[PDB]
């Protein structure tokens, strides 16, 4: 345990089951697949051979001629097509237990600790919209690829984070796996961690 400090480097040791959680890929490799699946529009194109704009008009008059054995131009094997298992609205959202959910964000937490890349720095909130102040905030502390994740409310901070695509708006209450994982440095206030405990474990 070690989540650093503002002016020092220290432990805070608010849990050790969230930051002494042992790591198995397998659980995380399910959750992360869900966050991806559950941001995924299921509402697809295509149309079926019932939903063809054709008709049943028959391009032969039974045997007597041998141009084709097909009775239809609403076949899916036609130039018109139809496709037998045509795409439409489909669900792609998985359940995933609340204890896997927490479970992930506890192993993933207690993996950043073992890979010392989790940073607790305070008062990183910005006084005014102007992203040259949110540049220097990361820069001077030699950070990039950040989340800037806090439960705390500064709106100039949400707004300014939108420019530069190596950082997006993140909140403690909004927390998920994939966002931690990609944006390697992980930035949080002393207050943020205290709340992150109750929200998760």
């Amino acid at each position: 345990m070690e989540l650093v400090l503002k002016d020092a480097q220290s432990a805070l040791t608010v849990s050790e089951t969230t930051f002494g959680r042992d790591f198995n890929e397998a659980l995380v490799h399910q959750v992360v697949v869900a966050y991806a699946a559950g941001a995924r529009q299921g509402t697809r194109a295509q149309k079926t051979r019932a939903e063809v704009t054709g008709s049943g008009k028959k391009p032969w008059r039974q045997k007597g001629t041998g141009r084709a054995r097909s009775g239809s131009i609403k076949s899916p094997i036609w130039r018109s097509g139809g496709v037998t298992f045509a795409a439409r609205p489909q669900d792609h959202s998985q359940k995933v237990n609340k204890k896997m959910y927490r479970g992930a964000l506890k192993s993933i937490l207690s993996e950043l600790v073992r890979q010392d890349r989790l940073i607790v720095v305070e008062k990183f909130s910005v006084e005014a919209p102007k992203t040259k102040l949110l540049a220097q905030k990361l820069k001077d502390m030699a950070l990039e690829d950040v989340l800037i994740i806090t439960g705390e409310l500064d709106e100039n901070l949400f707004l300014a984070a939108r420019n530069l695509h190596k950082v997006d708006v993140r909140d403690a209450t909004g927390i998920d796996p994939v966002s931690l994982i990609a944006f390697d440095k992980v930035v949080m206030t002393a207050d943020a961690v205290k709340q992150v405990e109750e929200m998760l474990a």
Partner: peptide, 20 residues
Amino acid sequence: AAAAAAAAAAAAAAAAAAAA
């Protein structure tokens, strides 16, 4: 450069079954 081409489907049968 016009094009017009149909398909045909009419019988060529005229001959009658053997040994009923």
